[PDB]
């Protein structure tokens, strides 16, 4: 379950998720799963999904994961008042803007890939579509 | 109207023959020993196919046909069992003369136009069980 080996700082500003994505195109595989909607991907989500589409291909072809959960989220536990600092680090997320490419794939029949990606997207919080790499 | 594949001079065990065509009204021992009297000429150890034809009066007429493509390819390559992994693992060999002998036996037993059509159907059964044609 992905997570930065080591970081400069332990915690982060909530920040915003605004504007559109970079890496709109499929640069490695023949096919890719692109995100239409905008949202935060926990590492758990990405892992579960990668699993789903790994079962789906019977471990053939190849799978890239283009997104990384590099920003730490915190939570104060239950029954704790406000203040007294910033909450402890719960988990990691990747900010996703419309038009990012979450996974790439190739070495597989197209039909099968659309399938595997449907099964992968069942595990994801955000609106997604199927896409093909193009010439230029 | 039934079919079985029975070893050369053999008949009347319980699981292979007796019940199968015995629930159809057929007398079991006349089939058994007129089939061992006909197929006494087939070599020991080859299953030979027999087509049993039953009529409303239970008197039957069977055409014993020539041994299978797979059995004559077991014997013409010398082997016992063919491949469990055909054309991946290859278990024996036959020159085109054995393809043509097995396909004269089966020239009596095929739908083929020429001995090249019967040699090609025995070619097909030669690629089925893994055997090499050389």
């Amino acid at each position: 379950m992905l997570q930065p080996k080591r970081t400069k700082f332990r915690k982060m500003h909530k920040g915003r998720n605004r504007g559109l994505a970079q890496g709109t195109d499929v640069s490695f595989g023949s096919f890719g799963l692109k995100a239409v909607g905008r949202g935060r991907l926990t590492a758990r989500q990405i892992e579960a999904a990668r699993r789903a589409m790994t079962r789906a291909v019977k471990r053939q072809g190849k799978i890239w994961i283009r997104v990384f959960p590099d920003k730490p989220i915190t939570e104060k536990p239950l029954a704790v008042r406000m203040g007294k600092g910033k909450g402890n680090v719960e988990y990691w997320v990747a900010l996703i803007q419309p038009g990012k490419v979450l996974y790439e794939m190739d070495g597989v029949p197209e039909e099968l890939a659309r399938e595997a990606f449907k099964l992968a997207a069942a595990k994801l919080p955000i609106k997604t579509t199927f896409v093909t790499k193009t010439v230029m | 109207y039934v079919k079985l594949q029975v070893a050369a001079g053999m008949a009347n065990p319980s699981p292979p023959v007796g019940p199968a065509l015995g629930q159809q009204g057929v007398n079991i021992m006349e089939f058994c020993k007129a089939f061992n009297a006909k197929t006494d000429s087939i070599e020991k150890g080859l299953p030979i196919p027999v087509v049993i034809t039953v009529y409303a009066d239970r008197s039957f007429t069977f055409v014993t046909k020539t041994p299978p493509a797979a059995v004559l390819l077991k014997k013409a390559a010398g082997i016992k069992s063919g491949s469990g992994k055909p054309n991946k693992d290859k278990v024996g060999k036959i020159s085109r003369a054995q393809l043509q002998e097995i396909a004269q036996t089966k020239a009596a037993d095929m739908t083929g136009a020429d001995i090249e059509a019967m040699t090609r159907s025995i070619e097909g059964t030669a690629r089925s069980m893994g055997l090499v044609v050389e």
Partner: protein, 94 residues
């Protein structure tokens, strides 16, 4: 062979472009060579179904502008982020 019909753009900027895109038309450009650049507009559909072939990118096509053809190649093309759409095309004089 691909033939694209086009009109000369009387306007420019973000506003012009987004009114273009609302009307189911889209802006593109023709540069390269001794000449000056020529900004033109196209029908989104025709071209979207035309670049739905591969050769579109490897070949010399023609563009009909005010009675006058130019022969060009496809240089680079920016697509809308998630939509089956085209924001723009760089045409380089062939």
């Amino acid at each position: 062979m691909f033939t694209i019909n086009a009109e000369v753009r009387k306007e420019q900027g973000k506003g012009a472009s987004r009114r273009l895109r609302a009307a189911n038309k889209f802006p593109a450009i023709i540069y390269g060579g001794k000449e000056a650049p020529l900004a033109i507009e196209l029908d989104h559909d025709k071209v979207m179904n035309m670049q739905a072939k591969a050769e579109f990118y490897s070949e010399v096509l023609t563009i009909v502008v005010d009675g006058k053809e130019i022969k060009v190649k496809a240089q680079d093309v920016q697509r809308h982020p998630y939509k089956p759409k085209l924001q723009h095309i760089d045409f380089v004089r062939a």
